[PDB]
Design a protein around this ligand. Structure first.
Ligand SMILES: Nc1ncnc2c1ncn2[C@@H]1O[C@H](COP(=O)(O)OP(=O)(O)OP(=O)(O)O)[C@@H](O)[C@H]1O
Ligand SMILES: [Mg+2]
Lengths: 578, 51, 471, 468
């Protein structure tokens, strides 16, 4: 291949010479240690390579070998229940070779070449196949993995292996032109996988949190952004989404964050049960981990690897949820690379093409009809970490132009231990109107009216909050004090949700609907009883108020009886009242 | 009540806004200085192509 | 000519740029085709030519290009687009190639996409009132035929719905003007820059429901498309619009989805070349580049056709002093600004009247065009709403109970104005309905406060009660 | 091995010098610069190419010239010699003794940069550490293996709190069971940009307590060259990692001031002509800070641990300054000192409201400690937030807008501080503090205790203030 020597070393940037014939965005192997790098600039006889590993100790004159292919991942059976590096290297297969520390230069295949899988053919000789079609099935941890034709392959079938057990590298289908199809194939991470058509998202993505499911919903092909300062609760929210959502496969991308947050997932997940299949929770999860003390240039590749794997699972008909832990770290890596290239920055040192990269990443989500004729979906929830909580920073403002929902976190609520600390005045969702027909048949026919009424109550309380702060709560009349107390009840008993409690961590739709109905029934009864001269003090001391406060700690199997008893008590206690 | 409200709410917010605006303007000035330095380096390097 | 010349000898590839040395025979601004080793062909444009080397910007991505097998060949000296009358009802990508599956069109002419400036002697004054069906636009910020009226939006604000509603409900009123002939429907040219699949699907479904896809031309540049293609899309769209309007007497309505993406692409190219920046890193020639796009709308003396522009742009952080809204306001002829406070209260369409403007409003309103009381009613409404906003500011300090009896009328006027005049929903209103509602609102104030209305109009129209309409 | 010297110096300007014909110089290597007078300076290669190599000098470049100066190679990777006998010694922050004792003999030579830990090889920090301070051990409890910084001010007693913690740190293997054994403990102390008075105070406290016999001090004064401030925490963390992961020691690492480290990093970065960041600080400060804080934790299959308590001061109490903002994104909590509590004489002035310990939930709970710990903590948080809120209401509106229900919140908020927060030089316990926490929850009614279950309320409700 194309072969040269190192000319200049400066940080993660290596300039090679004698590289005439190398192509842009290809993969090169740098030095005797065999590090991995990528071409990003060609200049005469030279080439500019960014290295994905540590560059300390390199010397001028070491060889550089160009592999002639772009960055690609291996897609096939054996990716579930796995933990991967930034460039798709199995960490558990690295620990058995290097110990507790991570050393550069170790090369491990992504898919295990020693496992035997049960093969079951579905095609026959004489058939013609196209890209995205299904050749056979392989059993996994409860799933049925389908062997897909690569999108660029077309031809007729000559011979098919019979049923049995084979490795992932044994050919199973041989075409007429001599092309051999194996159980896996490689795909470049910077190319989006093809589809037939895109569909309008029309089914909700159930997250298990009341505020995100009721007030600011997200659909089955939408994108959401959750920005906030440190300690707001982004990671807890994303992990609760990974634990409790209704997605078939969850892909978690730990881009540039702490290592304890990955060890917690690796340890606690095998002892949990997924909501829909009853098996271990880790059997449906794929982790891509690149911590903060790892090489910086590998942060950029991890996002593309995760989104490519999520797109691969979409082509099999599943519904995939992708969680990016931080995109600001990716922006920092882009800034570092641009600084090494000595390009002119636009704002805050960022390169001027950051928004294009962010728009290209978020556009891969959506509900599609696959090339095989099945329906699939990918949802992306990305977290932004603005410096000092400033929402005018370029990364936050470049994300708001493409996302369909915006879950804004607040430091004031997080300081007072009011979690999930979602600012319900600065947040919005653009999927509310399209999800109404689903609600009108899957929970109740009056759900949107109830939700709008509670939103109106919150707006009225927020309006009165300016008045109460300068005259005191006593100076207001009964009609305003009732609104204040009802708003406080809604805030402390419906929006708040403990993610560590045994029962309160997960909430269904019907439980939230029942709590909403109980709260509004109490409000209407109190509004009726106010006009009869009854004091606010007599109403606030009622024992039925504690029934609303403790309602969220009741389990799902016991909630309807509690709901009936609470409704009867609400209708009775005010009748007993004057 | 009016005196306490002014002295406890109005003044610190204005002070914080002033500090924020000063920081933004100083950062923009620093970026301009860096740009001017880079193009001065380019101008000096242009004349040394062939002496 | 009918010969092709290939320039091998590329010496530099980085970002969107590409250098070829011994290519002094390429004209400035010419279009080139870049052939890969595997046979893929990508477009390009010359932005600087010399006897030493030429500088070429690449439209698509640069993946797979190498310095040994890549070659550059010339297409044409001047960037031109092949237009026709039969392209109505088609769809194209950002560079004019068909994407609807139909065979390519047969060009009648080949026009340059940079265009030429209109002679100010050949222009004429736009004076045709357009009824958009929205009260805050028809009465206070009147839009005339031949106007550049951008929409200043935000992040989560519904600018697309407002643009679609304007395109759906746009009509002229020849009976009021005294013409009386049968109006023709507006031909629509729709140019998208970095649009998402959600907004594109919404626009496609809206145009399908309205049945306007038989009179529309579409230029689409999606979010996953190459960024540098956004430089060409408005120029092709405006070339098609100008051709139709000034060669076949069409009335063309042009919608540009997001000028912010165009400015981002311009900033990328300018920062690659390291020009002297303006504010926030944007290039210094952004004013001229934006002016070469907006100034291609208007009406020409001796011809029936017209071009109307509705650019849509999103203000970052809702900042009016950002360079893109600032330059757009300096170039265009007013703006329609959306308010987030009105959006949070459920008011649709959330059009804020005070920061809005219409420069050509005085040409299209008055006696013999709409009604003789239009301008005075608009002025009085503006003054009264400003007074109400100021009193709203005052009651945050002194409390509403400490007000005089006069200021409570202004407060109730502001509340009723926001709840009735602006909050109109999805219904279509004629100009008479909007003026009737406005006169109903003005009757809440005392008769002696109307300093900006002639006493004849007050005698003729004052006194109606709002309960006869929204009671 | 025999040495090699280069004489091809072609350009000296500021802190950088260029060396011609330096093909066999590795990247990041350590060099020794000698001049005509025989004085030796330090330097590090930061950029190497075919035409020249670029070396930044560890100190001032006065006296250098292009005729007599020569550059030699020391080692390709900067290494530190470590041994078990370092316990009780003092070092200047570069590895050389300052107590006048003979130098140690190196058991091993380890790279000071370190290597990232494999996330698979880690395990959950799950052991409680008794600090001897009541406001920490109850509401923001410190778990073995955590990195818990302290957010101080410009006139607040942070050094005294750190010294008290270092004096009173224990393991307490009684309540969760654990090994019930006498376990070794060590403290590694690093100070950057310290003054003479603080140096004397620190050494006097360590000598008077007697904790010097199990400690290693890396003390860097403010008049030292600024590179020795950069390498100071890395050597301390290298020693701590060696001790913990090769001798099963439970080490504790205290970093005196990260602000001086950040200012030295900015001064070094500005000399290499790099694009500045938010307030002139370098744009890669997140990665540089992360390479320090990420070297703590626990390792599966081993007994040792590393716990870090950095101390930093917020300039003008600005929580949005780049240094505290970037520190909060990496560490697992914060302890924030309040100036208002210090104004009224309360020691230690720890403000519970903005303090947080993220690893609390697995370090306390059923069997690990008292069962009621989590509900007690969160009820105290909610009640304190309400009390401070209505107190801020009173300071504007006045006492006329208070019912007895709100007056109870006011009395609770005024009560909490002087009994629990103020402790002076005491060495209190955990079971001591939990009864005091239950006592203050007794004054509020039962209906206010919504989050606490009826079982825990039924078992423990009702007790007066036990301060005597
Ligand atoms: N839903 C919740 N229920 C209970 N406690 C919560 C919840 N969300 C957050 N917390 C608390 O707040 C802390 C916030 O930690 P988390 O890692 O979620 O924050 P973050 O915003 O992702 O931080 P960082 O920016 O530092 O990565 C948690 O450790 C926990 O103590
Ligand atoms: Mg986090």
């Amino acid at each position: 291949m194309i072969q040269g020597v190192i000319q200049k070393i400066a940080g993660p940037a290596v300039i090679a010479k004698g590289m005439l014939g190398a192509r842009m965005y290809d993969i090169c192997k740098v030095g005797e240690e065999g590090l991995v790098g990528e071409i990003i600039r060609l200049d005469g006889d030279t080439a500019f390579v960014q290295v994905y590993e540590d560059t300390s100790g390199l010397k001028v004159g070491e060889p550089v070998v160009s592999t002639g292919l772009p960055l690609a991942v291996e897609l096939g059976p054996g990716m579930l229940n796995g933990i991967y590096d930034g460039i798709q290297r199995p960490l558990e297969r690295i620990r058995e070779k290097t110990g507790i520390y991570i050393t550069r230069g170790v090369v491990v295949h992504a898919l295990d070449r020693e496992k035997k899988w049960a093969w079951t053919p579905m095609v026959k000789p004489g058939d013609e196949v196209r890209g995205g079609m299904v050749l056979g099935t392989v059993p996994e941890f409860g799933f049925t993995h389908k062997i897909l034709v690569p999108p660029d392959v077309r031809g007729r079938v000559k011979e098919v292996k019979p049923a049995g057990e084979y490795t992932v590298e044994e050919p199973v289908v041989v075409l007429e032109d001599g092309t051999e199809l194996k159980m896996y194939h490689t795909w470049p991470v910077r190319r989006a996988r093809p589809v037939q058509r895109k569909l309008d998202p029309n089914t909700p993505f159930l997250t298990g949190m009341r505020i995100l499911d009721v007030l600011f919903p997200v659909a089955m092909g939408g994108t959401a952004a959750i920005p906030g300062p440190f300690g707001s609760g982004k990671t807890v929210t994303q992990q609760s989404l990974a634990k409790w959502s209704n997605a078939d496969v969850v892909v978690y991308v730990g881009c540039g964050e702490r290592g304890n947050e990955m060890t917690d997932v690796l340890v606690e997940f095998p002892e949990l049960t997924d909501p829909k299949t009853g098996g271990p929770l880790m059997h449906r999860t794929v982790l891509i981990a690149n911590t903060s003390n790892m090489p910086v240039a590998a942060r950029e590749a991890s996002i593309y690897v995760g989104v490519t794997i999520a797109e691969y699972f979409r082509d099999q008909g599943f519904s995939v949820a992708l969680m990016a832990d931080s995109t600001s770290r990716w922006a920092e890596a882009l800034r570092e690379i641009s600084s090494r290239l000595e390009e002119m920055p636009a704002e805050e040192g960022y390169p001027p093409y950051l928004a294009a990269r962010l728009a290209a990443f978020y556009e891969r989500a959506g509900k599609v009809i696959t090339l095989g004729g099945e329906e699939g979906a990918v949802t992306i929830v990305g977290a932004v970490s603005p410096p000092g909580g400033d929402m005018s920073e370029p990364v936050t403002q470049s994300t708001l132009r493409i996302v369909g929902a915006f879950w804004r976190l607040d430091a004031s609520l997080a300081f007072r231990r009011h979690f999930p600390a979602i600012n319900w005045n600065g947040s919005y969702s653009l999927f509310t109107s399209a999800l109404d027909p689903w609600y009108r048949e899957n929970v109740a026919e009056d759900y949107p009216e109830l939700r709008d009424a509670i939103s109106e109550l919150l707006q009225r309380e927020a309006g009165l909050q300016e008045i109460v702060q300068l005259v005191g709560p006593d100076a207001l009349q009964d009609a305003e004090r009732l609104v204040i107390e009802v708003g406080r009840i809604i805030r402390e008993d419906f929006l708040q949700q403990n993610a560590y409690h045994e029962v309160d961590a997960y909430c269904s739709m019907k439980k939230a609907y029942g709590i909403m109905k109980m709260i509004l029934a109490f409000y209407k009864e109190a509004e009726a009883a106010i006009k009869r001269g009854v004091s606010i003090d007599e109403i606030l001391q009622l024992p039925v108020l504690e029934r609303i406060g403790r309602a969220r700690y009741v389990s799902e199997e016991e909630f309807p009886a509690y709901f009936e008893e609470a409704m009867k008590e609400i209708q009775g206690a005010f009748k007993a009242l004057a | 009540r009016r005196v306490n409200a002014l002295e406890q709410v109005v003044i610190p917010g204005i002070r914080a806004q002033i500090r924020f605006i000063q920081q933004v303007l100083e950062q923009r000035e620093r970026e301009d200085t860096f740009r001017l330095k880079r193009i001065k380096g380019k101008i000096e390097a242009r004349e040394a192509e062939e002496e | 000519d009918l010969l092709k010349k290939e320039y091998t000898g590329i010496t530099y590839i980085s970002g969107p740029l590409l250098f070829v040395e011994n290519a002094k025979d390429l004209a400035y601004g010419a279009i080139v085709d870049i052939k890969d080793g595997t046979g893929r062909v990508r477009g390009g444009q010359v932005i600087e030519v010399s006897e030493e080397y030429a500088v070429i910007q690449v439209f698509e991505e640069t993946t797979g290009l190498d310095l040994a097998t890549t070659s550059v060949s010339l297409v044409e000296d001047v960037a031109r687009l092949g237009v026709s009358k039969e392209m109505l009802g088609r769809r194209f990508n950002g560079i004019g190639k068909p994407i609807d599956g139909l065979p390519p069109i047969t060009p009648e002419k080949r026009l340059p996409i940079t265009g030429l400036p209109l002679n100010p002697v050949a222009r004429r004054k736009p004076e045709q009132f357009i009824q958009t069906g929205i009260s805050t636009i028809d009465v206070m910020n009147t839009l005339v035929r031949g106007q550049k009226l951008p929409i200043f939006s935000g992040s989560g604000l519904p600018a697309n719905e407002i643009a679609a509603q304007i395109a759906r409900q746009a009509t002229v009123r020849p009976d009021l003007s005294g013409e009386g002939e049968k109006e023709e429907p507006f031909a629509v040219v729709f140019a998208a820059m970095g649009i998402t699949q959600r907004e594109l699907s919404y626009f496609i479904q809206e145009f399908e429901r309205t049945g306007a896809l038989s009179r529309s031309v579409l230029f689409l540049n999606k979010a996953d498309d190459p960024t540098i293609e956004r430089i060409l899309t408005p120029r092709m769209a405006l070339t098609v619009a100008e051709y139709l309007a000034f060669e076949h007497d069409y009335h063309v309505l042009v919608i540009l989805t997001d000028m912010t993406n165009y400015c981002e692409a311009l900033r990328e190219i300018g920062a690659a070349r390291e020009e002297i920046p303006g504010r926030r890193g944007y290039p210094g020639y952004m004013y001229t580049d934006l002016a070469t796009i907006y100034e291609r709308a208007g009406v020409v003396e001796g011809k029936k056709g017209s071009v109307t522009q509705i650019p849509i742009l999103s203000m970052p952080d809702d900042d009016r002093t950002h360079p893109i809204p600032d330059l757009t306001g300096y170039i265009t002829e007013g703006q329609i600004q959306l308010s987030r406070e009105l959006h949070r209260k459920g008011i649709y369409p959330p059009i804020d009247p005070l920061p809005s403007l219409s420069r050509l409003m005085n040409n299209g309103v008055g006696k013999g065009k709409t009604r003789e009381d239009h301008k005075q009613v608009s002025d009085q409404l503006y003054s009264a709403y400003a007074n109400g906003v100021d009193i709203r500011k005052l009651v945050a300090i002194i409390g509403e109970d400490a007000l005089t009896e006069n200021d409570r009328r202004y407060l109730q006027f502001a509340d009723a104005f926001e709840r009735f005049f602006i909050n109109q929903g999805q219904q279509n209103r004629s100009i008479e309905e909007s003026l009737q509602i406005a006169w109903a609102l003005l009757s809440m104030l005392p008769q002696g406060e109307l300093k900006r209305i002639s006493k004849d109009h007050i005698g003729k129209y004052y006194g109606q009660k709002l309960e006869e309409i929204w009671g």
